[PDB]
Design a protein around this ligand. Structure first.
Ligand SMILES: CCC1=C(C)/C(=C/C2=NC(=C\c3[nH]c(/C=C4\NC(=O)[C@H](C)[C@H]4CC)c(C)c3CCC(=O)O)/C(CCC(=O)O)=C2C)NC1=O
Ligand SMILES: CCC1=C(C)/C(=C/C2=NC(=C\c3[nH]c(/C=C4\NC(=O)[C@H](C)[C@H]4CC)c(C)c3CCC(=O)O)/C(CCC(=O)O)=C2C)NC1=O
Ligand SMILES: CCC1=C(C)/C(=C/C2=NC(=C\c3[nH]c(/C=C4\NC(=O)[C@H](C)[C@H]4CC)c(C)c3CCC(=O)O)/C(CCC(=O)O)=C2C)NC1=O
Ligand SMILES: CCC1=C(C)/C(=C/C2=NC(=C\c3[nH]c(/C=C4\NC(=O)[C@H](C)[C@H]4CC)c(C)c3CCC(=O)O)/C(CCC(=O)O)=C2C)NC1=O
Ligand SMILES: CCC1=C(C)/C(=C/C2=NC(=C\c3[nH]c(/C=C4\NC(=O)[C@H](C)[C@H]4CC)c(C)c3CCC(=O)O)/C(CCC(=O)O)=C2C)NC1=O
Ligand SMILES: CCC1=C(C)/C(=C/C2=NC(=C\c3[nH]c(/C=C4\NC(=O)[C@H](C)[C@H]4CC)c(C)c3CCC(=O)O)/C(CCC(=O)O)=C2C)NC1=O
Ligand SMILES: CCC1=C(C)/C(=C/C2=NC(=C\c3[nH]c(/C=C4\NC(=O)[C@H](C)[C@H]4CC)c(C)c3CCC(=O)O)/C(CCC(=O)O)=C2C)NC1=O
Ligand SMILES: CCC1=C(C)/C(=C/C2=NC(=C\c3[nH]c(/C=C4\NC(=O)[C@H](C)[C@H]4CC)c(C)c3CCC(=O)O)/C(CCC(=O)O)=C2C)NC1=O
Ligand SMILES: CCC1=C(C)/C(=C/C2=NC(=C\c3[nH]c(/C=C4\NC(=O)[C@H](C)[C@H]4CC)c(C)c3CCC(=O)O)/C(CCC(=O)O)=C2C)NC1=O
Ligand SMILES: CCC1=C(C)/C(=C/C2=NC(=C\c3[nH]c(/C=C4\NC(=O)[C@H](C)[C@H]4CC)c(C)c3CCC(=O)O)/C(CCC(=O)O)=C2C)NC1=O
Ligand SMILES: CCC1=C(C)/C(=C/C2=NC(=C\c3[nH]c(/C=C4\NC(=O)[C@H](C)[C@H]4CC)c(C)c3CCC(=O)O)/C(CCC(=O)O)=C2C)NC1=O
Lengths: 49, 172, 162, 162, 172, 162, 172, 172, 162, 172
């Protein structure tokens, strides 16, 4: 998964899924634990992958 | 991962052989009957919430100890993980049904699942029961004759049952 | 192996989602294209010996020098290996035809091709000549779509060699 | 949006490779299935007004308490918003049919659906009932494969709701 | 990422109305010539390295200074980068061809290219000439009526020309 | 679970350093706030049965339709599960009062709440009404700092549901 | 990120002097009413979904073009982004209220928010109006005297209004 | 991670019940004595360099073989690792003193420490001796009457001793 | 600058949530412990010169060789820098007392302390003995929790220097 | 980042010919003074803490404002950043001196160094003065011939002065 600066919603959500599956070691992260602000910053381009 | 075609090809390569005429006939039959397979996969996909909800209701009706304090689906987190597990297994069974091969269950869905459950302490008999209940609730939507041209799909039902039973037997 | 069904399943699985209409339509296209591809593979299998012998002789025609003593194309063993290699290429092309994807060629011939050819001092131009041959005769062995799938796979192998 | 062609090209680009048979076959399946999808789009667009009114009536039949005062459905403004939302769903189902992908539904309905519904205290069962009515009435005036496509897209929307 | 279908849908949703019967007719037309488009994409793909080699040979036989030391493509790695750029742009042109839309080329290939070449000192004129040379070679390969059923496909040639010209315009 | 003490210790631990004055002051505030919080927990423990019955009846009063045949409030098992769930929320609220942190609620209730209410089709508004009733009743069971501690944990749970 | 104590220490240090008697008086005054400020922060926190719901209802009543097709809150994705932004800004105003300083409101939340909105086409006037409506609901909730000990809090109301107006001015 | 409160809550959840009045009384007494507990933790934290220095001096006076060539603390990197380890263990003993529970000490410090030391060739008897000497130095500092209010803190002394003893037993 | 309130807001912000009972109780403890801390800051501020001159004399007593010619502490400028450094340390200790955290100490003293002392060959033991003198004087200049606060901050400074 | 030999090679390839005999003689002379240059670099490296200490003492003696609160070398954090910057500059000077190139200096830090100082607000002229003081200490160390055999090193001293001037001029 490579996520550029411009991307679509499907590419973004799939990249998020891949990131959470690897970086959290295939452990379940519930909807309450998911970082919304960090996802927003990545969506805007303020931070890279 | 393998589908049926790549599995036949891999079994032919170990022989240093081209695919035989009987193998090509079997693969032509598989593809020619593929529209029914697509209908079955769509049946699993479109009714997945219903399948999981029905199986969960039955599972926690038979086994109240899973949802008691101390049970392994007790708090919201454990129950949520249980529902994630059921959805994942059903999704992978649909993958296998599309592929005509169980290689994606062996390589992905069940690759280290028994060990996961054993280390966590999850009762694998209840997991196998959940998969059996999902099989029971999925056969109904597979056999639903509405919205599809009528035909003989007994082979698809048997294949889906083998995938569900493979998952259940690899858990327990 | 990277085939239509396999990439469908892998892309859906990487996003943790079921198979939707897009992927089912891709699968439908594969299942419909199976008939031309499978009978093209049938035709290529039935004519393997003639194709391989013609390919070996075409390589010896476009590269006369290799036939002389002291270099690669000389000796019974070297030419038996030429025939075996060309049979390998034809076998994995028929495999790809049947599997409806470049998977078998990608995983069996193309992965590690340059390193192996470099290590054993094997010219990719020999195999390109053999595959151009096989292309020419698969033109007349096949008609309609079957010719089309066979030539996509042969040209994929040629492009991998160049 | 996520169509067959877009998924094809995205997968090809992700490996940095050209478009080959394992992708052209998927695109071929899309082009084959285009005709039923466009026909279903015409059928769903022509009957849109009756579909929307009947869906709203189905929602009010299945959830009568909503009409009582102090509930979400009381008042002409709320019911106009109900008709507008059912029209939105129907319009994006037609778009998804045309594009042969869940892309319109995902981008315009599914993405942010749960948070939006929770914030405004919208019950997804209302929309599930409306889409079930639309599915039932799609059982009529659609025949064969076009009905299959419409039902698949509607079931995608329903599965996303629940 | 967008195609003709998604572009039309985006316009319709901007207006807030359904697609119109004229739009549905146009999209059905587009999908009816889909096999034509698949053959064009296969002509671009199967003959890509021949196209790149011919364009490179012509470009260096024309712009001789690049070969010579001190020229842009002189160092052996810079020749490698030259051919890599040509291959990438041809790949994205074939992408835009199959998609039937142009802006997918503009998004991930052309928005960041002009200032990149300017910072690197590469003459954009030579890059545009290389793109036009690939356009001519791919035009020859697309027009090739052998191996395929004979039919009128002037629209495909026009669309491929538009993609090549747009790429050249964005670079230069 | 995430308490004042546990966040203090985890902060010092992730920083690889001893506990300094700031963290001792945080702990001191926790140890002081414990007296009202434990008093509130004891009061809520005494009146748990009355509170659960009242909350269930408030849920049925505000949503009269659920008890109708064919909906989630019909049957003795469903209402028993209602009483069980209200008991769960009250128990974990008293746990969070004793622990001086939202840890019991976050770990045992809030983590997974949305997925579970969505799967089993439980309306969060039922639980919000029950918790609002319990809020009102503890307004009459407690006073002073006990009241504000209990209210803060109760409406932490409420905002978790909404 | 600063609070009132840290800001005071910073001003003292830039001169290089110990804190003055007046400064320590003011800081002890802030500290004695800090328990009064905790209730204001708790009022903001405990009613945040209600505040955001009221603000959203009134905002989309006032400006219906946003929720109409073509508006910047039209699809579900954009509406969810709008409610999330309201959530974020109210969160940071609560942080500013507890800290006694607006440093957190400016350093993290509003560093480049106007540029983000301008580049995305978000009408910053609409966002400032959403902030004002959130401020109105927040005032309605801070002044409730139920479950609190009655006392003077005009300082806290003024300071909260200042934080809300500072956020609104930053966006607009 | 746990403290006395979270531990009691977890046990009650396993039982499925509310915290009993006796448990609430125990936790009330704990929170009542928390000020003394903070004094003890500060005694550990403020005097930590002295504790480690005294333990190291006594340890290497007792076991000269540890600082000779071939000893396990011979070069500076090994001596630094020794002193670092001593500080880490003292720091987790202070954390466990604050929490009232040894869960953090077990989970973080003593998790696989015996096997780590065995695989390194570190004499675990000498590590346990070092932990005992830190216990002695600490016990001198926690019993200090200066700068506190005189009172009975024998429970704290015993609890800290248990933490040190549990560390030394886990290591050896 | 990392204080109780700053740590509170940092935790809440990093988890992307509102301030709840855990953070509010930590802030409550900060506010309750404010008054002894500001008391200690006032007491240490009134006694600027007594403490600083006594500390300089204490350093020159513990290390008599420093005052001799050819050593770091010979010269009126060096003496004035003694007073300036001890005054800086006392000033930041009072800042930390005011802010209820080592934040001022870490930002203005502890960060960059060791490299600066290396570069200018300033022995940390000089400052440690000065700070111990300050501690002994503060033992009687203050009583109770104000003395406890002052001692906690002076010992943090010392352990940073040791 | 290129060396004097690589500068000669780059110029030769830009002109497209082989290395000129005069150029070859110049590089032979560089190799002949290589041991000169290595003694110079050893003088820089071994005396680096002394050079930086002396330069800092002189710089803060002649510029007391940096010391004062509100100054730029205040507090320890900014003093450490000051000394670290001096260290990096002296390191880069030694790198360039060994290399025989000044472009290796300008491409190494000096591109971003000035505008970084500007964004911070650090006075660039004071950094130039610090570099000059480091130059003076470096000179008084390279002229030092104790335990080093005696001979002319005018080229080394001139080139070291040139590199120090280049650093102090590109910073300011
Ligand atoms: C420890 C934290 C925890 C909570 C809070 C929790 C809630 C919870 N309640 C459930 C049952 C239920 N709960 C309710 C809700 C009540 N019943 C009706 O009388 C009222 C209208 C309504 C008032 C709120 C219903 C209707 C069910 C039946 C679910 C079903 O059959 O689909 C279930 C489904 C599993 C089961 O069969 O027991 C869960 C997960 N579970 C947990 O582990
Ligand atoms: C290959 C695809 C895949 C699978 C299949 C998968 C299963 C899976 N289930 C897990 C947890 C779990 N799984 C369950 C489910 C069990 N609870 C019982 O009541 C039921 C009978 C049964 C389910 C039907 C539960 C309760 C947990 C949580 C364990 C815990 O929280 O301690 C975990 C550990 C992650 C975590 O605990 O956060 C995995 C990896 N993960 C994957 O990536
Ligand atoms: C977009 C995704 C997609 C789907 C879902 C799809 C399904 C599909 N179903 C078809 C008819 C059919 N569908 C079925 C399957 C049903 N028959 C029984 O009722 C079973 C309960 C059930 C399957 C388990 C059968 C047996 C046919 C008859 C066509 C044949 O057997 O050749 C056909 C061929 C039309 C015909 O010649 O009659 C297709 C292409 N195609 C697609 O492109
Ligand atoms: C394009 C995709 C899209 C959808 C689907 C959508 C749904 C939607 N419907 C809304 C209004 C509403 N919609 C309804 C629907 C109810 N009315 C009752 O008659 C029925 C039982 C029921 C419908 C089945 C109601 C009650 C509201 C008012 C909610 C409120 O503001 O309180 C709102 C909030 C309007 C605002 O900003 O104030 C949204 C976001 N919006 C979108 O942009
Ligand atoms: C496996 C990948 C794949 C490919 C490659 C593909 C192309 C394709 N080309 C076809 C014929 C054709 N091919 C072309 C292409 C044109 N002819 C001219 O000579 C031009 C050089 C050229 C412009 C690109 C045309 C115009 C037709 C006839 C179109 C028709 O059937 O009406 C057909 C229909 C043949 C039949 O069944 O009778 C297909 C399916 N489809 C696929 O699924
Ligand atoms: C540092 C804290 C922080 C803030 C403040 C923040 C706000 C923020 N809002 C954004 C977009 C947005 N913001 C809004 C909200 C506005 N649009 C209008 O219609 C409404 C009047 C109004 C809602 C009240 C919308 C709709 C978008 C999406 C715009 C688009 O996709 O084109 C984006 C960029 C893309 C994204 O993530 O969605 C950011 C970074 N994010 C953060 O991490
Ligand atoms: C768990 C976190 C926490 C909270 C929430 C908290 C609040 C709190 N509010 C208090 C009184 C108070 N509460 C308020 C609140 C104001 N009264 C007005 O009606 C305004 C509407 C309202 C502004 C929100 C005031 C003015 C006082 C009196 C404070 C004083 O006497 O100085 C007190 C002291 C009661 C006493 O000893 O007399 C506390 C501890 N403490 C905590 O540790
Ligand atoms: C292999 C590398 C290595 C080095 C370099 C080394 C130095 C070293 N010297 C030590 C003892 C010591 N070393 C000295 C220094 C000397 N005593 C005075 O007569 C002089 C002024 C001064 C020499 C210039 C002192 C005073 C002690 C005793 C410190 C104590 O009480 O622990 C210690 C503490 C352990 C002990 O021996 O008790 C170390 C680690 N150790 C090593 O393993
Ligand atoms: C800044 C962080 C912070 C600290 C450090 C703190 C400690 C603290 N210690 C206190 C008294 C005390 N402290 C102690 C403990 C000491 N007496 C024994 O001799 C032992 C030697 C030793 C413990 C090992 C005792 C026994 C009291 C008397 C209070 C009581 O017995 O209830 C008090 C109550 C006021 C007083 O009576 O002086 C506090 C608040 N509180 C804080 O907010
Ligand atoms: C804001 C925090 C801060 C501190 C604490 C600080 C200490 C400090 N003291 C300095 C000078 C000095 N300070 C002393 C202090 C010594 N004099 C002896 O009589 C005593 C034994 C001892 C006093 C306890 C000495 C000797 C120097 C001269 C060091 C030198 O220039 O080499 C210097 C070098 C400044 C210069 O060379 O102009 C620093 C950085 N700087 C800071 O920014
Ligand atoms: C490991 C680093 C290194 C060192 C330390 C070093 C010393 C050194 N200097 C040499 C020549 C020399 N180097 C110098 C340089 C000196 N002129 C002035 O006195 C200055 C103090 C100083 C330069 C800053 C001189 C004068 C000679 C001898 C004259 C000559 O043969 O050119 C030689 C060659 C003579 C032999 O080995 O027989 C060595 C080994 N060489 C190295 O590669």
């Amino acid at each position: 998964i490579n996520l550029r600066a411009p991307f679509t919603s499907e590419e973004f959500q799939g990249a998020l899924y891949a990131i959470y599956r690897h970086i959290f070691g295939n452990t379940y992260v519930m909807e309450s634990e998911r970082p919304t602000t960090a996802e927003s910053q990545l969506k805007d381009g303020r931070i890279t992958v | 991962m393998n589908d049926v075609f790549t599995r036949a090809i891999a079994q032919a390569d170990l022989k240093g052989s081209f695919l035989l005429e009987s193998d090509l006939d079997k693969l032509a039959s598989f593809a020619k009957e593929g529209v029914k397979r697509l209908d079955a996969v769509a049946a699993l996909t479109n009714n997945a919430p219903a399948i999981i909800s029905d199986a969960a209701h039955k599972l926690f009706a038979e086994q109240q100890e899973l949802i008691q304090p101390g049970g392994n689906a007790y708090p919201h987190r454990r129950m949520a993980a249980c529902l994630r597990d059921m959805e994942i297994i059903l999704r992978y069974v649909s993958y296998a049904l599309l592929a005509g091969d169980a290689s994606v269950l062996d390589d992905r869905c069940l690759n280290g699942l028994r060990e996961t459950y054993n280390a966590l302490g999850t009762p694998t008999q209840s997991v196998a029961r959940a998969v059996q209940l999902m099989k029971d609730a999925a056969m109904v939507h597979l056999k639903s004759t509405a919205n599809v041209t009528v035909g003989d799909c007994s082979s698809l039902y048997s294949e889906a049952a083998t995938y569900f039973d493979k998952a259940a037997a690899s858990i327990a | 192996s990277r085939t239509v069904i396999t990439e469908v399943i892998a892309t859906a699985d990487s996003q943790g989602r079921f198979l939707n209409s897009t992927e089912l339509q891709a699968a439908f296209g594969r299942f419909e294209r199976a008939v031309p591809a499978i009978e093209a593979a049938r035709a290529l299998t039935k004519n393997q010996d003639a194709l391989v012998k013609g390919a070996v002789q075409a390589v010896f025609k476009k590269f006369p020098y290799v036939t002389q003593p002291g270099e690669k194309g000389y000796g019974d063993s070297n030419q038996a290996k030429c025939a075996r290699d060309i049979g390998y290429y034809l076998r994995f092309i028929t495999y790809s035809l049947v599997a409806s994807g470049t998977g078998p060629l990608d995983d069996y011939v193309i992965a590690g091709l340059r390193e192996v050819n470099r290590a054993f001092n094997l010219n990719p131009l020999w195999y390109i000549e053999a595959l151009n041959y096989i292309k020419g005769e698969t033109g007349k062995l096949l008609s309609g779509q079957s010719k089309t799938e066979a030539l996509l796979y042969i040209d994929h192998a040629i492009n991998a060699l160049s």
